[PDB]
C-alpha cells in the first residue's frame, strides 16, 4: 500500500553521520566502479545508494577518459546504504547519463535519460520494466534532478529541463502514477535558471532548492503540490550559498531576483536547504571559489526575511579537502514510526583529473547524515584516499 508523505518535516538541531562508502579507499584493490555522481533514496524497507557508473572499474584501463560525463556506457545501479559501490553487489536499475529514482510504497521508479546530445530521451522504469518515454522538446541536453524524486499519495514527481546551460532554458514539472506520466507543467521563470534541484515533501507540498547556473549567486526555490500549481522565486537568505560567491558581508540577497556578482555568473554547484518554520538549514562549501569543505547553517528567518543571523553552524569537511554535489532526502514514517518526516542529506567528495591533474580517472565517494533533535558536533569525515593510483603510474 502506497506510501504517504502528507506529513510535516521534522525540526532538527544537528546532523549526525549515518554512512560512508569508503569507495575509493576500498577500490584501490577491490572491484569498485567509477562514479561521477551518487545519491540516496529510501523505501519502506531500506535506503539505497544510487549512482551513475561509467561502465568501468578503478585501476582498470577502461577508466582512462572518465572525465567525460556523457557517453553510451553509463548506467544507474543501486547498492544498499553504506556498502561500497562494488561490482558484485550493485543491482542494475537503468541505462542513463542523468537520472532520478524513488520508491512509491509498492515498487522503485527510476528515470534514465539516454540518447545523443541533440535528441535525448528519458525512459521511466517501474519495478524493472520500461513503462513510458519522454523526449526532448528544445532538443538540447535533457536533464533530470540528480537526486531522488518525491512521491506523495502514490504519485511521484520530478523536475526536468531542456535548453542552454549559461542562458535561459525550459523547465517542466512531471507527475506519474504506476510508472507512466499523467501530467506535465512548464515553469515560466524569465529571470533565472533551475537546473539540478534537490526536493523533499513537506506537509503536502513538494519543496525544491535548485541551482542557478546563470546570473546568480543564490538558490532558486520551486514549490508545487498535488495538481502542479507552483510558486517560483529565490531563497531569501542574506547568506549566499552557491559555490562562486562574494563573502557574506558583501552580498545583499533577494527573494525575487537573481543576484549576480564579479566572476560568479556562469557556474555553480548542486545543494540543498531544509525549511524549518521560517528558518533554513542551508548547506554550502566552505571556500567561496572552489568545491572544498562543507558547512550546514541554520539561518534565522532565512526562508523569507533577507536575514544574516546564523544561529548554528556545523562543519563536516574541513577546507583542505575536496567536496562536490549535495542533496536532500527524507526517511519516512514506515521506518521511524515518528509522526513526521526525518530530514537527511548526502555529500559527495570528488577526486581525479578536474583538480588532481596527474590522475587519469575521476570518481567520487558519498557520506550521509541525518537530523537529530539533540545538538551534535562536527568533524572532518573526508574520503582518505592516497592518489596517484597504480593505473596513474
Amino acid at each position: 500500500e502506497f506510501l504517504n508523505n502528507t506529513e510535516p518535516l521534522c525540526n532538527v538541531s544537528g546532523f549526525a553521520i549515518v554512512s560512508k562508502d569508503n569507495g575509493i579507499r576500498i577500490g584501490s584493490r577491490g572491484h569498485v566502479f567509477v562514479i561521477r555522481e551518487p545519491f540516496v533514496a529510501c523505501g519502506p524497507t531500506e535506503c539505497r545508494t544510487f549512482f551513475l557508473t561509467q561502465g568501468a572499474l578503478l585501476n582498470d584501463k577502461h577508466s582512462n577518459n572518465t572525465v567525460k560525463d556523457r557517453s553510451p556506457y553509463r548506467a544507474l545501479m543501486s547498492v544498499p546504504l553504506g556498502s561500497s559501490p562494488n561490482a558484485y553487489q550493485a543491482k542494475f536499475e537503468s541505462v542513463a547519463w542523468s537520472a532520478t529514482a524513488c520508491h512509491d510504497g509498492k515498487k522503485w521508479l527510476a528515470v534514465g535519460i539516454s540518447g545523443a546530445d541533440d535528441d535525448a530521451y528519458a525512459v521511466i522504469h517501474y519495478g524493472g520494466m520500461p513503462t513510458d518515454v519522454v523526449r526532448s522538446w528544445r532538443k538540447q541536453i535533457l536533464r533530470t534532478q540528480e537526486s531522488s524524486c518525491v512521491c506523495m499519495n502514490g504519485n511521484c514527481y520530478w523536475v526536468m529541463t531542456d535548453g542552454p546551460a549559461n542562458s535561459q532554458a525550459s523547465y517542466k514539472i512531471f507527475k506519474s502514477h504506476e510508472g507512466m506520466v499523467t501530467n506535465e507543467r512548464e515553469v515560466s521563470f524569465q529571470g533565472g535558471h533551475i537546473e539540478e534541484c534537490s526536493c523533499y515533501p513537506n506537509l503536502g507540498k513538494v519543496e525544491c532548492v535548485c541551482r542557478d547556473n546563470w546570473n546568480g549567486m543564490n538558490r532558486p526555490i520551486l514549490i508545487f503540490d498535488e495538481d502542479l500549481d507552483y510558486e517560483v522565486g529565490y531563497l531569501c537568505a542574506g547568506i549566499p550559498t552557491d559555490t562562486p560567491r562574494v563573502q557574506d558581508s558583501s552580498f545583499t540577497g533577494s527573494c525575487t531576483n537573481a543576484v549576480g556578482g564579479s566572476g560568479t555568473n556562469n557556474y555553480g554547484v548542486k545543494g540543498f536547504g531544509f525549511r524549518q518554520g521560517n528558518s533554513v538549514w542551508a548547506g554550502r562549501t566552505v571556500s567561496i571559489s572552489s568545491r572544498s569543505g562543507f558547512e550546514i547553517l541554520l539561518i534565522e528567518d532565512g526562508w523569507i526575511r533577507t536575514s544574516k543571523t546564523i544561529v548554528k553552524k556545523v562543519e563536516v569537511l574541513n577546507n583542505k579537502n575536496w567536496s562536490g554535489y549535495s542533496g536532500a532526502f527524507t526517511i519516512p514514517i514506515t521506518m521511524t514510526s515518528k509522526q513526521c518526516l526525518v530530514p537527511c542529506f548526502w555529500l559527495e567528495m570528488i577526486r581525479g583529473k578536474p583538480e588532481e591533474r596527474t590522475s587519469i580517472w575521476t570518481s567520487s565517494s558519498s557520506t550521509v547524515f541525518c537530523g537529530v533533535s539533540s545538538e551534535v558536533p562536527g568533524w572532518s569525515w573526508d574520503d582518505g584516499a592516497i592518489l596517484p593510483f597504480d593505473i596513474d603510474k
Partner: antibody, heavy 117, light 112 residues
Framework: LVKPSETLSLTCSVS??????????WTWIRQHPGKGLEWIGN???????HYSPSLKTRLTISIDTSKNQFYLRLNSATAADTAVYYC???????????????????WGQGTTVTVSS | DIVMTQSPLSLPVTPGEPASISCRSS???????????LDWYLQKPGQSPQLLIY???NRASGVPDRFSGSGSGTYFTLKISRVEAEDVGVYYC?????????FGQGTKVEIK
C-alpha cells in the same frame, strides 16, 4: 567596395530566433578567393568576446540586442582582406557539469568584400 | 594555433561506391573536459558551408544517413557509405579546442 586603409564594417541580422535566445555565440568567418576558410571572432549574447590573434589589433565586434543585429568593424583594411565574409551562430559551453557543442549549425549568405581603388 | 592537414587535396569518386576523407592535427584534440572538438563542413558549388559532423563521431540534424565519422587523438576520418550525386563539393575539417579555431585545407570531391 572598400578602398585601402579605410575602415571596413558589416551588418548581420537575426530572425525567427532573437539575440539573447538559445545562448549561442555569434561568429564571423572569412574566405579568400580560391583558399580555405578562416575564423575571425566570437561574441556572446552578453557581449563577452573572443578574437583571432592575427586580426586582434584591427578588429572591433559588437551586438545590439534591441535590433537583433551584430556587427564587424575592421580598421585599416588591406587589399589582402578581400574575401567573402560569412556570419554564423554556434551553441556551446565549457563551464557547466554537462558541457555541449553544436558547431556552427546555421550560416548566413556571404558578402563579397573587395578592397581596392 | 593547431595546424590542420588533410590528405587528399582532390578525391576522384563515382556514385554508388564508398569513399573516404581523413584529417590530422598538430596536437591531440582531446580537450581537458574529455570531449574531442572536431567537425566536418561541406561547401557545395556556389553556396555557404554546411554542417556534417559536429564532434569527432556525431552527425548533425538533417544530414543524410549516409555519412559516418571516426577517430581520436590526432587522426580523424569521414566515411561515405554510398556516394550520390548531391555530394559534390569541398570538404573542410575544423577544430574548436583552442581560442583560435582553424579549418583544414579543403578536399575537393570530383565525380569520375
Amino acid at each position: 567596395l572598400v578602398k585601402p586603409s579605410e575602415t571596413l564594417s558589416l551588418t548581420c541580422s537575426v530572425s525567427g530566433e532573437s539575440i539573447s535566445s538559445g545562448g549561442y555565440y555569434w561568429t564571423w568567418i572569412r574566405q579568400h578567393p580560391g583558399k580555405g576558410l578562416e575564423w575571425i571572432g566570437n561574441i556572446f549574447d552578453t557581449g563577452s568576446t573572443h578574437y583571432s590573434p592575427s586580426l586582434k589589433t584591427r578588429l572591433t565586434i559588437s551586438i545590439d540586442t534591441s535590433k537583433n543585429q551584430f556587427y564587424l568593424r575592421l580598421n585599416s583594411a588591406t587589399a589582402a582582406d578581400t574575401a567573402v565574409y560569412y556570419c554564423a551562430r554556434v551553441g556551446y559551453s565549457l563551464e557547466t557539469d554537462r558541457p555541449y557543442y553544436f558547431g556552427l549549425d546555421v550560416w548566413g549568405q556571404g558578402t563579397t568584400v573587395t578592397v581596392s581603388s | 594555433d593547431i595546424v590542420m592537414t588533410q590528405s587528399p587535396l582532390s578525391l576522384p569518386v563515382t556514385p554508388g561506391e564508398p569513399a573516404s576523407i581523413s584529417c590530422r592535427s598538430s596536437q591531440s584534440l582531446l580537450h581537458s573536459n574529455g570531449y574531442t572538438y572536431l567537425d566536418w563542413y561541406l561547401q557545395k558549388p556556389g553556396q555557404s558551408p554546411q554542417l556534417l559532423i559536429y564532434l569527432a563521431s556525431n552527425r548533425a540534424s538533417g544530414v543524410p544517413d549516409r555519412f559516418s565519422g571516426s577517430g581520436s587523438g590526432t587522426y580523424f576520418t569521414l566515411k561515405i557509405s554510398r556516394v550520390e550525386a548531391e555530394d559534390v563539393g569541398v570538404y573542410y575539417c575544423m577544430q574548436a579546442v583552442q581560442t583560435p579555431w582553424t579549418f583544414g585545407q579543403g578536399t575537393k570531391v570530383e565525380i569520375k
